Write a protein that binds this DNA or RNA. Structure first.
Ligand SMILES: [Mg+2]
Ligand SMILES: [Mg+2]
Ligand SMILES: [Mg+2]
Ligand SMILES: [Mg+2]
Ligand SMILES: [Mg+2]
Ligand SMILES: [Mg+2]
Ligand SMILES: [Mg+2]
Ligand SMILES: [Mg+2]
Ligand SMILES: [Mg+2]
Ligand SMILES: [Mg+2]
Ligand SMILES: [Mg+2]
Ligand SMILES: [Mg+2]
Ligand SMILES: [Mg+2]
Ligand SMILES: [Mg+2]
Ligand SMILES: [Mg+2]
Ligand SMILES: [Mg+2]
Ligand SMILES: [Mg+2]
Ligand SMILES: [Mg+2]
Ligand SMILES: [Mg+2]
Ligand SMILES: [Mg+2]
Ligand SMILES: [Mg+2]
Ligand SMILES: [Mg+2]
Ligand SMILES: [Mg+2]
Ligand SMILES: [Mg+2]
Ligand SMILES: [Mg+2]
Ligand SMILES: [Mg+2]
Ligand SMILES: [Mg+2]
Ligand SMILES: [Mg+2]
Ligand SMILES: [Mg+2]
Ligand SMILES: [Mg+2]
Ligand SMILES: [Mg+2]
Ligand SMILES: [Mg+2]
Ligand SMILES: [Mg+2]
Ligand SMILES: [Mg+2]
Ligand SMILES: [Mg+2]
Ligand SMILES: [Mg+2]
Ligand SMILES: [Mg+2]
Ligand SMILES: [Mg+2]
Ligand SMILES: [Mg+2]
Ligand SMILES: [Mg+2]
Ligand SMILES: [Mg+2]
Ligand SMILES: [Mg+2]
Ligand SMILES: [Mg+2]
Ligand SMILES: [Mg+2]
Ligand SMILES: [Mg+2]
Ligand SMILES: [Mg+2]
Ligand SMILES: [Mg+2]
Ligand SMILES: [Mg+2]
Ligand SMILES: [Mg+2]
Ligand SMILES: [Mg+2]
Ligand SMILES: [Mg+2]
Ligand SMILES: [Mg+2]
Ligand SMILES: [Mg+2]
Ligand SMILES: [Mg+2]
Ligand SMILES: [Mg+2]
Ligand SMILES: [Mg+2]
Ligand SMILES: [Mg+2]
Ligand SMILES: [Mg+2]
Ligand SMILES: [Mg+2]
Ligand SMILES: [Mg+2]
Ligand SMILES: [Mg+2]
Ligand SMILES: [Mg+2]
Ligand SMILES: [Mg+2]
Ligand SMILES: [Mg+2]
Ligand SMILES: [Mg+2]
Ligand SMILES: [Mg+2]
Ligand SMILES: [Mg+2]
Ligand SMILES: [Mg+2]
Ligand SMILES: [Mg+2]
Ligand SMILES: [Mg+2]
Ligand SMILES: [Mg+2]
Ligand SMILES: [Mg+2]
Ligand SMILES: [Mg+2]
Ligand SMILES: [Mg+2]
Ligand SMILES: [Mg+2]
Ligand SMILES: [Mg+2]
Ligand SMILES: [Mg+2]
Ligand SMILES: [Mg+2]
Ligand SMILES: [Mg+2]
Ligand SMILES: [Mg+2]
Ligand SMILES: [Mg+2]
Ligand SMILES: [Mg+2]
Ligand SMILES: [Mg+2]
Ligand SMILES: [Mg+2]
Ligand SMILES: [Mg+2]
Ligand SMILES: [Mg+2]
Ligand SMILES: [Mg+2]
Ligand SMILES: [Mg+2]
Ligand SMILES: [Mg+2]
Ligand SMILES: [Mg+2]
Ligand SMILES: [Mg+2]
Ligand SMILES: [Mg+2]
Ligand SMILES: [Mg+2]
Ligand SMILES: [Mg+2]
Ligand SMILES: [Mg+2]
Ligand SMILES: [Mg+2]
Ligand SMILES: [Mg+2]
Ligand SMILES: [Mg+2]
Ligand SMILES: [Mg+2]
Ligand SMILES: [Mg+2]
Ligand SMILES: [Mg+2]
Ligand SMILES: [Mg+2]
Ligand SMILES: [Mg+2]
Ligand SMILES: [Mg+2]
Ligand SMILES: [Mg+2]
Ligand SMILES: [Mg+2]
Ligand SMILES: [Mg+2]
Ligand SMILES: [Mg+2]
Ligand SMILES: [Mg+2]
Ligand SMILES: [Mg+2]
Ligand SMILES: [Mg+2]
Ligand SMILES: [Mg+2]
Ligand SMILES: [Mg+2]
Ligand SMILES: [Mg+2]
Ligand SMILES: [Mg+2]
Ligand SMILES: [Mg+2]
Ligand SMILES: [Mg+2]
Ligand SMILES: [Mg+2]
Ligand SMILES: [Mg+2]
Ligand SMILES: [Mg+2]
Ligand SMILES: [Mg+2]
Ligand SMILES: [Mg+2]
Ligand SMILES: [Mg+2]
Ligand SMILES: [Mg+2]
Ligand SMILES: [Mg+2]
Ligand SMILES: [Mg+2]
Ligand SMILES: [Mg+2]
Ligand SMILES: [Mg+2]
Ligand SMILES: [Mg+2]
Ligand SMILES: [Mg+2]
Ligand SMILES: [Mg+2]
Ligand SMILES: [Mg+2]
Ligand SMILES: [Mg+2]
Ligand SMILES: [Mg+2]
Ligand SMILES: [Mg+2]
Ligand SMILES: [Mg+2]
Ligand SMILES: [Mg+2]
Ligand SMILES: [Mg+2]
Ligand SMILES: [Mg+2]
Ligand SMILES: [Mg+2]
Ligand SMILES: [Mg+2]
Ligand SMILES: [Mg+2]
Ligand SMILES: [Mg+2]
Ligand SMILES: [Mg+2]
Lengths: 200, 143, 64, 115
RNA sequence: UAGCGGCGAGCGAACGGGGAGGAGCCCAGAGCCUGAAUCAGUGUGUGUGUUAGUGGAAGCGUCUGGAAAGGCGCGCGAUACAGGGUGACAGCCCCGUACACAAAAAUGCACAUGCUGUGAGCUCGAUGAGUAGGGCGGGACACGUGGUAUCCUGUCUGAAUAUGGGGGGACCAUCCUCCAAGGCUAAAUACUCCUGACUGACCGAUAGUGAACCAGUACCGUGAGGGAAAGGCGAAAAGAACCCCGGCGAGGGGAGUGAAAAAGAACCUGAAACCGUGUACGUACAAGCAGUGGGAGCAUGCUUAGGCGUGUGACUGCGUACCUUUUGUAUAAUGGGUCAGCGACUUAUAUUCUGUAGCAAGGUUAACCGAAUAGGGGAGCCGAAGGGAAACCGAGUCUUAACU
């Protein structure tokens, strides 16, 4: 069960979803993988091939009292080479469905212990305005939050862009890193019901 | 847990062998590949199954057999995955929808893998002498 | 890219249930009249690959 | 991520050049030469911790042999005379007594004379 | 994988399946009837989009400082806390930003539709000859002439032509399947000299383009062609009026600006090599990798009324540099004039093994639909069964006539 702060209604949520042992390694791996997915990795140096110049030997092999050289472009020279030049690469890494679900089940269950998960009934601002949302969180005693909702209101969305420490994401689009990052998590009764069914 | 507080399980990560980095690294100067020779060099080493010019094992032995085309289009149905189709009818097209065997497999055979419960009438399918005892002992009549 | 099997090896070896490889014996193609029957009989069945040269087979054909 | 390494190297050279402070010529000024001298200084330092113990023993033994022969006994018979009288006093002290308190030392030789 | 292959090195399919995207028609021509589907223009309709743009919210007081955006304390706008500038770090000083509005004129689009101009329904009969195939020689097919189907042809030949011909991998015969010897067809696909916007676990002047700078310049070459080096005063030039020395010089010293001028243009920071000036000790009877353990004196500090630290190092025991390559190097074997910067086990996909996490006789998705790191999609793959060359049999099976 999960009590509310303006009703005290017994929302009987599943045991294994919101009440399991916090597996650290899984969560760590999934959040690290999620971070690694965020990278675009758009970078490139140029190999001795790719550098502009000639392939001609600056001086002949023998005869001259100098270190044998083949090109201007060689990485031991100045102004051309970079031995192992990088290529635009994809750092995103695979995560198993059961591991991603297991990690969400692991982190979302730990918020019930730490009391960061503030489950609520209907949560929605009157008109599309930040001023009201900023004021109404002072009564709720919140600052840095992830307001999860089932029915995503444009009124509520538009009202929480400009606020830095608030973020409004849909119950469908919850993430591993976000649930960990934010200092509290305000879930709607519908959103809990959706996420329960989604994670299963 | 916060974003900093997390950590991996002890044993997960293992750094990586960084060659050519001083004496203290152990490996460093000739990074774990000895002094001179073909193997030490960049792009070094020989190709697969090369025994220094001696006639390799994969050539000094005679080649045998031929690959059967009929063996490609036959399956070995394990009797454990028998009652997973449509009650108790397992011809071929029915079995194929259950994803037990591949699409291009006309011939097929049921072997004694163990465990049957429901009565399954195994029609239009070759069946083994041990499986014929089991399948009937469960209840279902073959053919 | 994927590893290419050393085809010549793929036709001379077959992977048994445990992991070892069966192979046909040499010295049973030609020049057989001078050979005694006891050799030719012993060379006829297939035989297992030795421990020493197992790594040379395993590398040549990584798939099966 | 490119790692420019001008900061760390200089610190490593500077650390060693500080250890070479006092030496003649490029051995103090020039890392490539200093680093050899600082290592060899370590090799000699490691060695001479063993030799310090040897040299001082010889140095004491010379003083004891000098102070004993004044009283009429050679070092060989003196130490045997002390060992036969079961005296546990070492060379370090015997040499120190031999220099400082000779009126004291005399009695040790007279004790060695008995045995 | 099946194959191909001095059956070596290597090369490497299709069938079938899951997806993206889907669309078809004209000719080798004769009736009635004919502008009606169709497009290809001159166009007409809004909607635009675009190349100029407009508005666009709400802060004050003290403290430190050269300077406030800073601290400190109280406000207020937020569909605007993207970002930039401003004398240090600005939601509210400025330019922007979100949001609502814009085009006289040229244009790129998607639908009405007047139209020089183009052909609908339906009869009866046509169905691409030096061609298909063949011999010879080459080539393309994963397929190297091999038992080699298939296609293309240089060369020499030669059918039937729909009661016909092609194909089904030598070939034949039955079945099935298509209809060559003429054409036109969007989308999914590849690319970015170029124009915008936006983003980086990209670089920050030996890096990043060769080129942050009047660089494809200087310079080199007959020429094709090669090809550099070189960034930063300060918030603001307030870039030093004026004296003094000097050659109505270079260069300095004062004065003056400024928070600061060892920030004064050879201009932030200013290392090291290298070259000096002055202070302390040692140093002109003393042999050698120049150090190292011992150690007198002398010179400097501290607190005490006695001991330490630091610099120096007379004299003295031991002591032949580093790297490389080697059986072995003080070696008179290699390499290094020194310093600073840069300079070498990497990246991608496959594979086996170790560790670790998930789930477990199961595990698991790939491309793709996705506003998208969810969730679909199990097409597949791998495992749970192997023996046999193979048919085939299967907790057995191979061998063999058969197995104690
Ligand atoms: Mg050339
Ligand atoms: Mg040379
Ligand atoms: Mg030279
Ligand atoms: Mg380089
Ligand atoms: Mg350059
Ligand atoms: Mg470069
Ligand atoms: Mg990787
Ligand atoms: Mg925070
Ligand atoms: Mg915004
Ligand atoms: Mg569950
Ligand atoms: Mg599910
Ligand atoms: Mg640890
Ligand atoms: Mg790596
Ligand atoms: Mg070692
Ligand atoms: Mg090794
Ligand atoms: Mg070497
Ligand atoms: Mg050797
Ligand atoms: Mg070697
Ligand atoms: Mg090479
Ligand atoms: Mg190689
Ligand atoms: Mg399947
Ligand atoms: Mg034998
Ligand atoms: Mg046999
Ligand atoms: Mg072994
Ligand atoms: Mg197999
Ligand atoms: Mg297999
Ligand atoms: Mg950097
Ligand atoms: Mg000294
Ligand atoms: Mg010292
Ligand atoms: Mg020098
Ligand atoms: Mg110095
Ligand atoms: Mg030694
Ligand atoms: Mg000793
Ligand atoms: Mg051969
Ligand atoms: Mg075929
Ligand atoms: Mg075919
Ligand atoms: Mg197909
Ligand atoms: Mg369409
Ligand atoms: Mg269409
Ligand atoms: Mg307009
Ligand atoms: Mg404004
Ligand atoms: Mg102020
Ligand atoms: Mg402060
Ligand atoms: Mg405050
Ligand atoms: Mg923006
Ligand atoms: Mg900003
Ligand atoms: Mg700003
Ligand atoms: Mg910028
Ligand atoms: Mg400042
Ligand atoms: Mg700030
Ligand atoms: Mg601030
Ligand atoms: Mg403020
Ligand atoms: Mg107009
Ligand atoms: Mg208009
Ligand atoms: Mg007008
Ligand atoms: Mg025009
Ligand atoms: Mg035709
Ligand atoms: Mg043909
Ligand atoms: Mg013919
Ligand atoms: Mg033919
Ligand atoms: Mg002929
Ligand atoms: Mg031909
Ligand atoms: Mg072609
Ligand atoms: Mg060829
Ligand atoms: Mg052949
Ligand atoms: Mg032809
Ligand atoms: Mg014919
Ligand atoms: Mg004719
Ligand atoms: Mg027809
Ligand atoms: Mg007809
Ligand atoms: Mg007929
Ligand atoms: Mg044919
Ligand atoms: Mg056939
Ligand atoms: Mg046709
Ligand atoms: Mg035709
Ligand atoms: Mg046609
Ligand atoms: Mg043709
Ligand atoms: Mg088109
Ligand atoms: Mg289309
Ligand atoms: Mg714009
Ligand atoms: Mg970044
Ligand atoms: Mg930087
Ligand atoms: Mg440059
Ligand atoms: Mg610089
Ligand atoms: Mg460019
Ligand atoms: Mg120019
Ligand atoms: Mg000239
Ligand atoms: Mg010229
Ligand atoms: Mg002046
Ligand atoms: Mg004057
Ligand atoms: Mg004058
Ligand atoms: Mg003059
Ligand atoms: Mg001047
Ligand atoms: Mg002047
Ligand atoms: Mg002045
Ligand atoms: Mg004056
Ligand atoms: Mg004055
Ligand atoms: Mg002043
Ligand atoms: Mg002042
Ligand atoms: Mg100053
Ligand atoms: Mg200052
Ligand atoms: Mg001044
Ligand atoms: Mg001044
Ligand atoms: Mg000063
Ligand atoms: Mg001054
Ligand atoms: Mg500055
Ligand atoms: Mg300066
Ligand atoms: Mg300086
Ligand atoms: Mg200096
Ligand atoms: Mg002096
Ligand atoms: Mg003096
Ligand atoms: Mg003197
Ligand atoms: Mg003399
Ligand atoms: Mg002297
Ligand atoms: Mg001399
Ligand atoms: Mg000597
Ligand atoms: Mg010396
Ligand atoms: Mg010393
Ligand atoms: Mg000492
Ligand atoms: Mg001393
Ligand atoms: Mg000393
Ligand atoms: Mg003194
Ligand atoms: Mg004093
Ligand atoms: Mg000496
Ligand atoms: Mg010596
Ligand atoms: Mg060498
Ligand atoms: Mg050796
Ligand atoms: Mg040698
Ligand atoms: Mg030696
Ligand atoms: Mg030498
Ligand atoms: Mg040599
Ligand atoms: Mg060397
Ligand atoms: Mg060098
Ligand atoms: Mg040299
Ligand atoms: Mg490696
Ligand atoms: Mg576990
Ligand atoms: Mg478990
Ligand atoms: Mg299951
Ligand atoms: Mg799909
Ligand atoms: Mg697969
Ligand atoms: Mg499979
Ligand atoms: Mg099998
Ligand atoms: Mg019989
Ligand atoms: Mg029998």
């Amino acid at each position: 069960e999960l009590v509310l702060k303006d009703a005290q209604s017994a929302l009987t949520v599943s045991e294994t979803t919101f009440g399991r042992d916090f597996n650290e390694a899984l969560v760590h791996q999934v959040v690290v993988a999620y971070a690694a997915g965020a990278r675009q990795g758009t970078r490139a140096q140029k190999t001795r091939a790719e550098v502009t110049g000639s392939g001609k030997k600056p001086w002949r092999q023998k005869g001259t009292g100098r270190a044998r050289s083949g090109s201007i472009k060689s990485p031991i020279w100045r102004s051309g080479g970079v031995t192992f030049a990088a290529r635009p690469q994809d750092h995103s890494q695979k995560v198993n469905k059961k591991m991603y679900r297991g990690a969400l089940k692991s982190i979302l269950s730990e918020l019930v212990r730490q009391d960061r998960l503030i489950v609520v009934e209907k949560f929605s601002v009157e008109a599309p305005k930040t001023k009201l949302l900023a004021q109404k969180l002072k009564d709720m005693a919140l600052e840095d939050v992830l307001i999860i909702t089932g029915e995503l209101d444009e009124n509520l969305f538009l009202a929480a862009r400009n606020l830095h420490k608030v973020d409004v994401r849909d119950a469908t689009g919850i993430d591993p890193v976000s649930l960990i990052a934010f200092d509290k998590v305000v879930m709607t009764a519908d959103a809990v019901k959706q996420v329960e069914e989604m994670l299963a | 847990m916060r974003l900093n507080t997390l950590s991996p399980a002890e044993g997960s990560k293992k750094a990586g062998k960084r060659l050519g980095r001083g004496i203290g690294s152990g490996l460093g100067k000739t990074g774990g590949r000895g002094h001179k020779g073909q193997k030490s060099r960049s792009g070094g080493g020989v190709r697969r199954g090369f025994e220094g010019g001696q006639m390799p094992l994969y050539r000094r032995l005679p080649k045998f057999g031929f690959t059967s085309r009929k063996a490609a289009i036959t399956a070995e149905i394990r009797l454990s995955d028998l009652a997973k189709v449509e009650g108790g009818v397992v011809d071929l097209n029915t079995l194929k929808a259950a994803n037990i065997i591949g699409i291009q497999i006309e011939f097929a055979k049921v072997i004694l893998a163990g465990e049957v419960t429901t009565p399954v009438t195994v029609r239009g399918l070759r069946v083994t002498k041990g499986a014929r005892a089991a399948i009937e002992a469960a209840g279902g009549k073959i053919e | 890219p994927k590893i290419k099997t050393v085809r010549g090896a793929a036709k001379r070896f077959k992977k048994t249930g445990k992991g070892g490889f069966k192979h046909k014996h040499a010295n049973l193609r030609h020049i057989l009249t001078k050979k005694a029957t006891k050799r030719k009989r012993h060379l006829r069945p297939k035989a297992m690959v030795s421990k020493g040269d197992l790594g040379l087979v395993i590398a040549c054909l990584p798939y099966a | 991520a490119r790692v420019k390494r001008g900061v760390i190297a200089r610190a490593r050279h500077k650390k060693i050049l500080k250890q070479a402070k006092g030496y003649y010529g490029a051995r103090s000024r020039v890392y490539r030469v200093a680093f050899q001298a600082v290592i060899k200084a370590g090799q000699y330092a490691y060695r001479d911790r063993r030799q310090r113990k040897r040299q001082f023993r010889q140095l004491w033994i010379a003083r004891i042999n000098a102070a004993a022969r004044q009283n009429g006994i050679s070092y060989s018979k003196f130490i045997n005379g002390l060992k036969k009288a079961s005296v546990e006093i070492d060379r370090k002290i015997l040499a120190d007594i031999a220099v400082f308190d000779k009126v004291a030392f005399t009695a040790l030789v007279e004790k060695a004379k008995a045995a």
